[PDB]
Amino acid sequence: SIRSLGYMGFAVSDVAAWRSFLTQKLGLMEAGTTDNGDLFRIDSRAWRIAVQQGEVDDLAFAGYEVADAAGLAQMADKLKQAGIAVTTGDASLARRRGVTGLITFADPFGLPLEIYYGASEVFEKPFLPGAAVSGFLTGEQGLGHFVRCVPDSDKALAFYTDVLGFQLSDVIDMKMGPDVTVPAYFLHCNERHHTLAIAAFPLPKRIHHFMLEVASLDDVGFAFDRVDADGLITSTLGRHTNDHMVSFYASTPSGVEVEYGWSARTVDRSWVVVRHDSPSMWGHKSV
Amino acid sequence: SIRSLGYMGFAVSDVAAWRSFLTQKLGLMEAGTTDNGDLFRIDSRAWRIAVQQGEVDDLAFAGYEVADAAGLAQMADKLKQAGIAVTTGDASLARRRGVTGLITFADPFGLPLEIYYGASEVFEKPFLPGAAVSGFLTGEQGLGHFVRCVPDSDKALAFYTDVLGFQLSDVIDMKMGPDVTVPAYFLHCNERHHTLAIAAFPLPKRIHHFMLEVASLDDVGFAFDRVDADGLITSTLGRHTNDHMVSFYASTPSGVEVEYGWSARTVDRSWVVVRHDSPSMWGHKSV
Amino acid sequence: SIRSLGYMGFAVSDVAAWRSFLTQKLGLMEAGTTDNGDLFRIDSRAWRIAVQQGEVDDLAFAGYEVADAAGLAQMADKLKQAGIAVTTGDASLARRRGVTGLITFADPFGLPLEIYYGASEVFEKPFLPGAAVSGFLTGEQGLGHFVRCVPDSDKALAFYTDVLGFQLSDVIDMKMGPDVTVPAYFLHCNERHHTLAIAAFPLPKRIHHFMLEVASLDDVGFAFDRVDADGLITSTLGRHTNDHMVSFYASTPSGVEVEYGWSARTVDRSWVVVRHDSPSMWGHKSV
Amino acid sequence: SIRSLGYMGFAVSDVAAWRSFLTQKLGLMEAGTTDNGDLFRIDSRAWRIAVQQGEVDDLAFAGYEVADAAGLAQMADKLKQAGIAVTTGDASLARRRGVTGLITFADPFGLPLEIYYGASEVFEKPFLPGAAVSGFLTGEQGLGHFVRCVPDSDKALAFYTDVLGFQLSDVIDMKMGPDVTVPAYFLHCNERHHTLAIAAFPLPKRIHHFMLEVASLDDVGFAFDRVDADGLITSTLGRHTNDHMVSFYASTPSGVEVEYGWSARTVDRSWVVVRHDSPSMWGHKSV
Amino acid sequence: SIRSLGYMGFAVSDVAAWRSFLTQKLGLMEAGTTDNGDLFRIDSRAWRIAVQQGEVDDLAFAGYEVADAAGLAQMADKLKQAGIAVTTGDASLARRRGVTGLITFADPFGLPLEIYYGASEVFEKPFLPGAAVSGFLTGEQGLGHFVRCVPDSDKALAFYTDVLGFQLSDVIDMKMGPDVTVPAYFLHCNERHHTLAIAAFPLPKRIHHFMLEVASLDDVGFAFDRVDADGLITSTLGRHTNDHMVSFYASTPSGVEVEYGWSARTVDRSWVVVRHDSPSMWGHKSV
Amino acid sequence: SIRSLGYMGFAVSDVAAWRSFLTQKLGLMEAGTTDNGDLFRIDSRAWRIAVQQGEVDDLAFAGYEVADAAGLAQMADKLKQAGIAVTTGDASLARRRGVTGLITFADPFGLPLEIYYGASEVFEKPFLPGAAVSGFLTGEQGLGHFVRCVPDSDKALAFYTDVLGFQLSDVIDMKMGPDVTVPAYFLHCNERHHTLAIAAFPLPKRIHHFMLEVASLDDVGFAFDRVDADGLITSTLGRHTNDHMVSFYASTPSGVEVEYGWSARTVDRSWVVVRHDSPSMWGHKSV
Numbered sequence A, B, C, D, E, F: 001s002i003r004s005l006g007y008m009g010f011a012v013s014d015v016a017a018w019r020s021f022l023t024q025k026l027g028l029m030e031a032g033t034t035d036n037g038d039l040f041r042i043d044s045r046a047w048r049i050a051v052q053q054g055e056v057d058d059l060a061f062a063g064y065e066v067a068d069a070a071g072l073a074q075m076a077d078k079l080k081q082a083g084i085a086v087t088t089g090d091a092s093l094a095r096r097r098g099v100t101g102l103i104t105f106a107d108p109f110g111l112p113l114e115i116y117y118g119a120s121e122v123f124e125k126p127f128l129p130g131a132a133v134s135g136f137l138t139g140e141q142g143l144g145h146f147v148r149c150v151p152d153s154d155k156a157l158a159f160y161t162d163v164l165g166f167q168l169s170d171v172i173d174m175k176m177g178p179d180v181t182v183p184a185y186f187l188h189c190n191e192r193h194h195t196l197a198i199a200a201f202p203l204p205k206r207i208h209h210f211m212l213e214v215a216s217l218d219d220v221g222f223a224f225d226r227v228d229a230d231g232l233i234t235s236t237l238g239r240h241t242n243d244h245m246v247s248f249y250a251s252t253p254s255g256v257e258v259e260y261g262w263s264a265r266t267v268d269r270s271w272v273v274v275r276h277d278s279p280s281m282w283g284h285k286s287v
């Protein structure tokens, strides 16, 4: 089974702008440039986010991590049983991603996805943030989460749940006007409240935002100010109703947003599905 | 010696507005009306804040608490030795304040002050906040703090330090324009980083603001939204450089502000005086 | 200085009734009979309560403990300096009490008092309660407390405070009718909120009650039922406003009451004197 | 299933040198001499390491522990199902090893292996180290680990994983020259990050080294100096990238090395396989 | 002021017997032989017990530790003010003891005493017990205690209390026959319940026993058996009424006894003097 | 009284080399350049180490921190009473150092010293290390320590102890050849085992080394490798006998060494002076 979101790749029009934003604003660590593009770290892994030159200015691909080779084989079988076109990543791609093995495919709406095992650790190159950040929260919870924008949430939900094995945490019926209410589904694959959210929003991108979690409230507070200095804040500090994460949102150079948060609650086998009519307990005022 | 700030009285033009603000917005508990005015609670004490009808729309008086009768006598002696006009509170005033004994006087610039002992507890009338607040932080740290605006900080500092016994925590040189920088002094009389601050600000009131501390970040977050709904926020959420309190500021019906915060650090006998050039680590953006 | 209340002696008309009450109802341990009367234990000390045959049916004497011989000498000097008639306990009395040294005198209203040092421990005779009690709370807090009924509280307060060194914790103005309100003073000599209380009640005894503290709520609950079975309960379970002790009151065979409680808060050097208008937060309904 | 590495036997040319090295340098306890050779302890077990006279100067055999007789029977069946020649240890061998029951066989490359249950405890002969060592870490993690040098890692990996049940922790691609890179596989059978490692190194011995873990950093520091005094250090202090153990390496009298470490992290069912390009975060400089 | 008992020296007729007893039976560490005699350790200090050849077969001297040079000077002054003959230890003696400075004198009954500061630490020679002992308890509590046998306890008590500054913990009236009861005084100079005890016992030695405290119950249990094997036990395992130490007693080769214990309670400034009629809660049966 | 070592200034011939060494090797944060020279941080303080252009290639000055203005006045008085030439730092110097007030003078051998109060905090510019360091340990323990090389240790000791108020922790008699042994004195002014050490070493500099303490063992391990890469290590990893700090030593561009450590023990009022014959328990091999 999939254990977590392991990495993400972005294809952007302004690579230099993304380099500055990720390091100076968010505090990620520059980790070199390879055939995989500019690499960025948040922990012991060789890379978590890759930035390549591209006109889409959007998420180019996402990689989900399994525990081992057997886990990869099981997922490949499940995908093919579901009629999904699966391709074994050649040695060249595995090297580019720095993984031992991987398979590639796309979700129902074209997002390139990868499932891999045996990623590269670089403890000998101790993580040093590009900005003052006490630390990022990863471990068994993986990289964080992102919100997949789709045309049909039911079809997307069925794929991620029935085929990829994600489990529902909760639903938030997002009010988008007196005559518009869209359900947002939050799914987990580990203790992180959600690793993936699905919603039918009127956005021209594959995702609304990706989220990175930090170790302290000050990490969030300082980052907010660094981002605000450039007028990139899209939402004030607030706490979510479902995962109870305290965060703010900001614009990346590609328009896609990034959520930066702290203190979210986790889920387990005793968790029960619930619904909400608001996404924020307090704060998160649109600006 | 003075152990803490015990209570405050305000003389306001719109008593009903203050009643609604303190209870519905800040979460204080209405505790009846007596010859002491409308009373409000935040803990086991019979009252901490009193609101009376008055045209000044400002702090009318403040009461500092001593441990016992002997403590009151010592302070009265110290004040008279300093040439300050001290008056023993008559039985009528003691009853009004609900204290066992007290003395009255004024600081160098006219603020009526009182030092008392033996205030009234009402554990049999369990505290119930007027809004969703997990709790206020008082105990040995007292009510909170307020910032006394004065024409001459040196004279004020000498009185509060040499006569009343407050001790300096730190100084912040507040930038108020390319050609204006004013020092703000933060003083303690217990573990609370500061119970009183002194500064020469261009304000027509006795104090810039008073501060109340709550038990959780959510208490602050929810209150921010309740206040923001009425457009009364004066500063966004932020954390101070000196006491490390996370708070926001808002306007009371009298114009004087109120600071609502959480998680401040405390001080002790190992504390050393320092200086700062900024009052906020992050946040506290003027709005 | 006096460190705690160490023991109490009662002169009663029905010794057998007291023996049964203390052991079967309250859970004290029978510890033999000597020239000191019937002895009862609650901890490692050879005895804490003595019961002798007497028509007064009241507290016959109370012993306060000092840390050592030097402490005893200091107290004897303080008492004589105050004009109090002090008598050195002869070897015979010291043996009877099982102490190394002691002095005797009376308070302003005739209560025989003793100050001693070097009491006897009997760890080799492990404490075994006479009823199901997980344990009594003593240690540095001593035996517990009792309430001295006096004709003039001011005179009594001055003696116990100025001469014996007790310190005021708080005051409760006890309502005893639309036209009657009497102040009750609670005094400490260690961490126990109060070891002695003073009040001018209309009672024909030296004390209103003595109090013993137990280790768990169940100890109190079970004892309540054992006492209630004989119709001796005088007050339902409740919690006090000042020491926050959860307790109930009952009648001893002498009429004097006994308070049996659990979970009281303690005091220290940061404590400030306060006042109350009620003695109970909840419960303690007279029955 | 195999629960841990339980013991090891070495056949050496200089038994006296090994006796001195194990006790004076590493701190093991001499535990007598039997038909099993010279015995050495590190905990409550009668012996963990045996040293016999032999010209190979290498690991002579290794014993893996199962929980009980049923566990032994299951492993014997699994081995025979795999076509491995298994022999039931006769009463004579069981006595020599001090175990209740055992089976013997060899791995694909000739290393004599044993699986047993019911080893002997000697709590009545309290462990006393031969040198200043606060303690060795064993318990459910067993003796420690050793690195099996093989000609074909794939064949070895398949045997230890598919037949013996070891699970992969991670892989480190060891750089051994611009044109030489060999993968080292680390396998676990309990919480210890690895109980066995497999690699195709150019060494004329069955193992590169065996490892013993101690309770404190000082245990390692002092041992380093005792070994360094004789010029036997082969690697400076360092911390591994995979198990995060802080250790140093040294030469035994047989040339085979020994690793002595502290503070390694453990693994569980939430562990995911990863890869590394370096075996040390810091230190471990070859000397 | 004296901070603890730092070391002891014994003059014995059978040095080899003492060497074996201290190391093999009690677990002390042999620490070389100098002009100070055979040295033995129990912790980081270069030595705590010295054994020299002598016909007295008794304690030859004891050294009390002060915090620094100023402390030594103060004690020397106090002793001379009391009329005691004090001698400054020459450089030769200081070297022999491995201390920076010391003064020598005798107690009222001839026991040679020394007060010193700046003893030698040997952390570079890590403590290794001569037998299986998890550790000895020293630190701020010093070496342990010993019981000084005297002809006149009152005179001895006055010297150790009034001159050396020891403080009384408690008294035990030791029953030694229907017509014989002797008081034993236990004195502290730090947190250890007692560092010195004084009693008028009918023994031909300077001390009844010296005591060493270990870290676990097993340390005591195993030692008991090692001593019992040679028939040297003088008292079964038991727990004391005053310090609550669990221990046993045994005969040294000189006849003087040694107490070996674990888990004693400590004392502080809140401690009150008490008396006992038995020295043991349970156990300590004479054999 | 002096509370800690607050800052140090170095006058060096190669400012760029020092900039690279402090940031890239040790992990300090570049904090701008002012009339005070190049500034470097390790915590919330505006600066802790300053580097100015100078031919001495040595410590140029050191600043000791007092708690407040009163503390500064007391020290100035003590110094003048001792006949030391004290100069009040003018507003220009105070600004350069970023302190509220300070006095200047020199120790007996020419080292310029300063005592100040009210240094500048910059929490709004969150500390970001120049290399991977989890954190530096400062707080109430100050910057760290340095070893003052002097011609006459007795004279130096008397000044720092009798005049500046430092207290002795311990002494280590450093072996420097069969015929050379020099005592090194370690002094504290707070909980840090030593803030200053004094010794008569044959070095042409004012100090042998200065020391910085980090939060984890890995911080030390990684730094060791960064320094070793340039062949600047002067001592292998080891742990000291007196403060039990685990550290290594390296050469700065000025020749003066720097010690980088972790996990030292602290001292308090229960500490007793001792002596040592070795400075290291293990490690610290000269290379």
Ligand SMILES: Oc1cccc(-c2c(Cl)cccc2Cl)c1O
Pocket: A202, A203, A204, A205, A207, A208, A209, A234, A254, A255, A256, A257
């Ligand atoms: O906040 C956002 C999150 C995801 C996509 C867009 C976006 C929109 Cl709504 C229109 C044009 C281009 C972009 Cl990147 C966006 O503004």
Ligand SMILES: Oc1cccc(-c2c(Cl)cccc2Cl)c1O
Pocket: A147, A172, A184, A197, A199, A208, A211, A240, A241, A242, A243, A245, A259, A279, A280, A284
């Ligand atoms: O992490 C989250 C938890 C709950 C809701 C949102 C959310 C919001 Cl607040 C706005 C748009 C889209 C989403 Cl998924 C979210 O990002």
Ligand SMILES: Oc1cccc(-c2c(Cl)cccc2Cl)c1O
Pocket: B202, B203, B204, B205, B207, B208, B209, B234, B254, B255, B256, B257
């Ligand atoms: O934020 C504030 C704090 C204290 C006083 C005033 C004030 C001013 Cl600045 C002008 C007129 C009236 C008032 Cl209440 C104010 O606006």
Ligand SMILES: Oc1cccc(-c2c(Cl)cccc2Cl)c1O
Pocket: B147, B172, B184, B197, B199, B208, B211, B240, B241, B242, B243, B245, B259, B279, B280, B284
């Ligand atoms: O509690 C506080 C700590 C530090 C600074 C201020 C402050 C600010 Cl942020 C603006 C105006 C006046 C003050 Cl005292 C403050 O209120």
Ligand SMILES: Oc1cccc(-c2c(Cl)cccc2Cl)c1O
Pocket: C202, C203, C204, C205, C207, C208, C209, C234, C254, C255, C256, C257
């Ligand atoms: O509850 C009580 C506490 C103390 C004394 C009496 C008492 C009274 Cl109020 C009258 C006669 C006899 C007694 Cl013991 C009593 O009833």
Ligand SMILES: Oc1cccc(-c2c(Cl)cccc2Cl)c1O
Pocket: C147, C172, C184, C197, C199, C208, C211, C240, C241, C242, C243, C245, C259, C279, C280, C284
């Ligand atoms: O322990 C106590 C704390 C507060 C009040 C009383 C009290 C009551 Cl509840 C009734 C009569 C007398 C007293 Cl002292 C009391 O016994």
Ligand SMILES: Oc1cccc(-c2c(Cl)cccc2Cl)c1O
Pocket: D202, D203, D204, D205, D207, D208, D209, D234, D254, D255, D256, D257
């Ligand atoms: O460090 C080592 C680990 C295992 C084996 C050898 C070895 C070699 Cl590489 C050659 C000859 C003999 C030996 Cl023991 C060795 O030196």
Ligand SMILES: Oc1cccc(-c2c(Cl)cccc2Cl)c1O
Pocket: D147, D172, D184, D197, D199, D208, D211, D240, D241, D242, D243, D245, D259, D279, D280, D284
């Ligand atoms: O315990 C370990 C963890 C990671 C790597 C090695 C290793 C090294 Cl550092 C050199 C040679 C062989 C091995 Cl297995 C190792 O012994």
Ligand SMILES: Oc1cccc(-c2c(Cl)cccc2Cl)c1O
Pocket: E202, E203, E204, E205, E207, E208, E209, E234, E254, E255, E256, E257
């Ligand atoms: O247990 C003992 C403690 C101290 C001294 C002696 C002793 C006696 Cl009681 C007589 C002769 C010799 C000795 Cl050592 C002893 O037997």
Ligand SMILES: Oc1cccc(-c2c(Cl)cccc2Cl)c1O
Pocket: E147, E172, E184, E197, E199, E208, E211, E240, E241, E242, E243, E245, E259, E279, E280, E284
């Ligand atoms: O440590 C101790 C605590 C209480 C009593 C004794 C004692 C005994 Cl049990 C017998 C003889 C002498 C002594 Cl001091 C003792 O050694």
Ligand SMILES: Oc1cccc(-c2c(Cl)cccc2Cl)c1O
Pocket: F202, F203, F204, F205, F207, F208, F209, F234, F254, F255, F256, F257
């Ligand atoms: O390790 C050292 C610490 C302090 C000073 C020097 C030094 C020496 Cl010993 C000679 C010339 C120049 C220097 Cl910096 C040095 O080498």
Ligand SMILES: Oc1cccc(-c2c(Cl)cccc2Cl)c1O
Pocket: F147, F172, F184, F197, F199, F208, F211, F240, F241, F242, F243, F245, F259, F279, F280, F284
């Ligand atoms: O922090 C320390 C503790 C004990 C000793 C030294 C030291 C050493 Cl190891 C060599 C030269 C000088 C000193 Cl002060 C030291 O720097």
Ligand SMILES: [Fe+2]
Pocket: A145, A147, A211, A259
């Ligand atoms: Fe999100």
Ligand SMILES: [Fe+2]
Pocket: A167, A188, A268, A269, A271
């Ligand atoms: Fe789930």
Ligand SMILES: [Fe+2]
Pocket: B145, B147, B211, B259
């Ligand atoms: Fe404030």
Ligand SMILES: [Fe+2]
Pocket: B167, B188, B268, B269, B271
């Ligand atoms: Fe203070």
